[PDB]
Design a binder for these strands. Structure first.
Lengths: 287, 287, 287, 287, 279, 287
RNA sequence: GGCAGAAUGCUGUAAAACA
């Protein structure tokens, strides 16, 4: 199915251990790039979440952020290190003896690293819930991508309908275009004949006759819109395939615009460029 | 109707507690880029804000910054962890017995992590007003775009009037230059004392007239100014269509300059090219 | 007069509130692009500053940066969160009751986050001074543009005198076209020893004399240097008009080089192309 | 054998001293960059660890973390630095003389870095096992890379088979396209009432056919897929070479698309570009 | 002499204040375009630096970056903001009212941000030394252009020697060409007219083409020693070379002269390709 | 005399006070950054050490470790910045005048950054010997860098011999390729075409010869290996100069691949890019 | 108009680069 490369997904899980929030953002990119902002406590989950991301997403820069705020009140009571505190007090008394003046601060002893440390919580139980929330976030992310992808497909199918209409309007002027093609070649034949001892006369006519195929340019445009409809229903990653198709649309419209056949044909040729330009806008953020 | 691609809208809301400001900027771009700088608390508004913006704007580098200024005075009172504070004080008194000296600092106990924190935020109600301000800011942003859009349209229309005047001037000058060549050619024959063959002079003068015939270029230029006037009345965005029309304008001006032989016609062609360049400069800012 | 596109202006203002610095720098550009890097407190000045910049300037890549350095101490007494400071005192007092001993350091409460809110500034009287500094910086920027522009005008006029000198040299080293081809044909036909008709041969000499005659090309070169002098004295924007004029200068030099039949003319054509190239380089710096 | 730049490997050793864990993770990178998260006890092993990894590996970003968990008995209690403590007391007394007031806080002396530091064991025997454990991790790392690289090689081979199929399809379609295009071009001249020498016209038709013939491009594509198979069969460092081969693939496909006439050839060129893009995506993750 | 538009030059000036590294990098360009990445402290030097560079270079896209690494110890001695300290003391006194206890610590006031900030550096004598390094870097930059332009000059002179050899080879066949031109003139006359004959005589003969080629070679040799900006002048000379050789390429008499003309065209194309990257 | 950014130098100094070991290690970096592991006894030597190291080095991440083993016979003292220590006390006294209370903690003055600093003028007997040991260690570190960079120079020059081999290899294929194109073209015209019509065969071959003419790229490649040899003997910091040279190497190598019409040349141009990639990897280690 | 392709604009590349 058609998918977009700009989606936002968010999930949050709460419990006695605390609250953990998963956030996922996507921006357009040629390849798949994953950047993580995991907390230091759960730094060990990076390979697993990276594999989970790469297993479902196929293109676009992805930013994943995990915020973990433990419940301090629900945490176990802090335990006082009896031996470590006693060691510091005896050591601090020695410094008082050398300096002959001192005042032990009881809070400063408690603030020392190690002493008065809370018991470590069971991170293994939290990891499973966090991974479940990550899977839910991936599901929401894919749903958001698909929801916006349908909008892009509708916009592109709207533009492609206009391209066929513009081809029909240009085909309405074929009797005038065919008359113009003859005059382009007839004038060149006699213009070169007026010039004397001019070589490569046949080369000019042969090259010129190849570059006035207005009928063939419309056929290729009509063949691309038929194919572009088929590309949109491939159910695979067609983001890049459409990007290479837009270059073929650009190639045909560029040659048609430079013809300058007629005032009314020029308006349609300008419109073809506009439709392709608008169509190329949507292809940028398709996956 | 038409809109400028650069604008600036700022809206500030003074709620019961705190205040928020919505700021929008826009710069010229070939596609639509929407960059958001939302605060940490309201980071989840991006999908809602992005949808509400991409549905009203077509092109430009739109940057939206939401600045949240909480009222600490009106903020919820910090909750004091009585049990955690009591645990530290009793443990501090344990050190005091062994140290035999020292006084517990009341501020130091409060400075301990987890003793005091903001228990409640209640951001669901305050986020509704912020989103409501966004709809107001977009309306001002669109009006700012349309206000500057009219100046661009007026400038483009003035330059189009100048283009029509220059075309009329060239058309007026053309017959005199056509007659000037005939007098100069016969003068050289008279100066060379050579009697040209019958119908050779008439045949030769046809080639020069074809060389200096710019009627088709002027007709195409008038058709292009009429088409540009029609385009400027369209409700859809016309930045790309006008930018493509300027290419046809440039083609006609280049052909006129190339086929020019008189100083006055060359000066008029240069004036046409200057007018087209000014038109394109104004077009770059059109939606 | 004419103004260079690249310039640099800087202006610093001091006061009891602090220091502010305006820096404006521009470089060559096809159109007018203005990028503003304003401080956070003064982001609301962007529309006014942009309007003034666009009013004063025609084209360039102008970038304006405002550096704001508020004084740390201002507005008399420091702004204190009275509720938060009082709230911590009550909480600290409760800790004293349990421990029966303690003291509250005033700086400890001041160092508490939120108690010392960001110092309030008027931000309205300072805006007038900043806008006045912006106007002064615009005056300096325009003066610097005009000073550099006068040097560019001298360089262009020096090369224009070179073009007139080269045209004089060509008109003196150019032999009589009718006589030059007559002598060349006679010698070549002397080997053939057969002449179809002397009467018809003389007619073709005059008709095809203009093919190799460069008198017409030289007159247009002399007409353009007179026009280029006139363009340099206009009050409007001149860079675009002169840039399109150099195309006409190059058009004549190419035709003069191709039509050249003598080494002196060809060497002069190269010299003309060098002078035009040197003259075209300076025009790229004129707005 | 071909290897990948993304792999994982973990090794742990259990002993009476404690438990040490080695973790290696690789992410694709242009060059080799090594980051080490080593404990303070084994910080001196970084130059030894870095040399072993840089010698065995060639490319990719590698992050190696050594998780050292000593036993309670193996932990060394903090030892007071009496020599350093007495120096600070003398240093503090010098400042007291300048101020004539103040008292030295005994805890503040202890909190000074280096005064209260745990004794460091020899750990020479323990580190000897760590290096052997690290060498085991590196041995499994290469094996881990090789298994992952086999899938990439299989994918690249499948896409190369698709490329060969597309090339043979284009070669099958081409002669009919060439035959019809020549027939259409000569018929176009007849409709324009242009009479040309058959010998001269036929010579121009042959040269134009050589201009629009794509046999050489397909031959180059076949040679490129054969060389790609050889490169895959090569031994080491076939990432960047293979990427350059993909650049050549893209060049040939772009030439084929630009020189194409029929819609089928254009569709085949689009398919070739899609296959080359997928190969580039896979190859970006190859050492 | 000949200057190549691509070069690199680096100079580092070191001192008690820190370091300052100038890194000029240049590639090809039709005109002179300079881009600067200056540190925030020395961004005001752009007009002075830009003027200095524009006066010593003629073409190329120059990218000059100044890297400033100020020293921590180079900062001035601390000064006391008496206005800010007094405000903090009054602010501290307010808290003492509610608490009705406590003593303000003088050092804690000094530890507050902004009350003992160091004096700003002069940044005036430093800029004088930085501009001295820029002047030196340009001298190194020019040498890097000249040491690369000598190779291009040698290649162009080699191609010019090849062109002279080809011209001599063509001149060795002058009587054969002269006979061919007479037959061509008679053939058109005997076909029957005057319209075609007059322009045929107007066309440049082969000997004049070779003389113009030799004159172009001599002028190119002089230009390579002109000792100024000769990139565009050499490009125009190559255009003239192409215009002269097109006649020989078009004319067909025999295999040897055709091969010599093809060699001349290839040599002129190589010269033109190598000219594009000379300042 | 190329210096590499990876080196190691250890120097031990023995005296009556004990044994002091200076170790210096360097790792690749874009700029110069120094980290010190001085014991707190000699912590005040950090500014002088940093000044000397930044004076004698240009680029690279440098880690310096000093191990000090004092003896009971000799006792040292902490070097203090007397000028700054007295200034802080004077400033504190001024604050005491306004507050009319307070006391100065001696440890607070010492903890102030810059107070625990040393200068070369005021150094102990041991400190001067430590500084001399550091000078010797830095000289040995420079020697190690020079002798490690000699290996890098050999590695790079080995690749440069490959580049000249590829350049002379392509130069032999070029006369064969152009000659082979002649046979292929006349084979097509050998069917029923008399190629002796004007010079279409020769003009096409001339046009083809100018399209595939890679002589300009090969000469610039050869002129860049001559200059790269001289850069490797400049006896200065040429790490960045070589990096810019490789960009010029890749610029000509990639253009050679593009203009190539034969598979052998393209396979050679791929080899040129690989040699550049191998050289680029070593250049990252060059100071 | 960094180098180069096709014919203002679009691709390849330096760019897994430089801010």
């Amino acid at each position: 199915m058609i998918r977009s490369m700009t989606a936002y997904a968010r999930r949050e899980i709460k419990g006695e251990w605390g609250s953990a929030t998963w956030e996922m953002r996507s921006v357009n990119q040629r390849y798949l790039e994953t950047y993580f902002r995991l907390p230091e406590q759960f730094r060990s989950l990076e390979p697993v979440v990276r594999e989970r991301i790469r297993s479902r997403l196929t293109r676009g820069k992805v930013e994943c952020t995990l915020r973990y705020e433990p419940d301090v009140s629900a945490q176990g009571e802090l335990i006082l290190n009896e031996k470590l505190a006693k060691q510091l007090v005896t050591a601090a008394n020695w410094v008082k003896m050398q300096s002959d003046e001192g005042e032990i601060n009881p809070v400063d002893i408690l603030r020392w690293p190690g002493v008065m440390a809370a018991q470590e919580q069971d991170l293994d139980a939290i990891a499973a819930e966090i991974l479940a929330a990550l899977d839910g976030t991936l599901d929401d992310f894919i749903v958001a991508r698909e929801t916006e992808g349908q909008a892009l497909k509708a916009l592109i199918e709207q533009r492609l309908e206009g391209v066929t209409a513009e081809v029909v309007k240009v085909r309405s002027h074929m009797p005038e275009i065919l008359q113009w093609q003859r005059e382009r070649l007839v004038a060149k034949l006699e213009d070169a004949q007026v010039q004397l001892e001019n070589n490569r006369l046949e080369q000019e006519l042969v090259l010129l006759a190849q570059r006035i195929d207005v009928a063939e340019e419309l056929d290729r445009l009509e063949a691309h819109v038929k194919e572009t409809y088929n590309i949109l229903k491939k159910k695979e990653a067609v983001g890049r395939r459409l990007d290479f198709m837009m270059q073929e649309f650009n190639r045909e419209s560029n040659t048609l615009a430079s013809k300058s056949i007629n005032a009314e044909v020029t308006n349609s040729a300008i419109e073809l460029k506009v439709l392709i330009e608008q169509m190329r806008e949507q292809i940028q953020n398709i996956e």
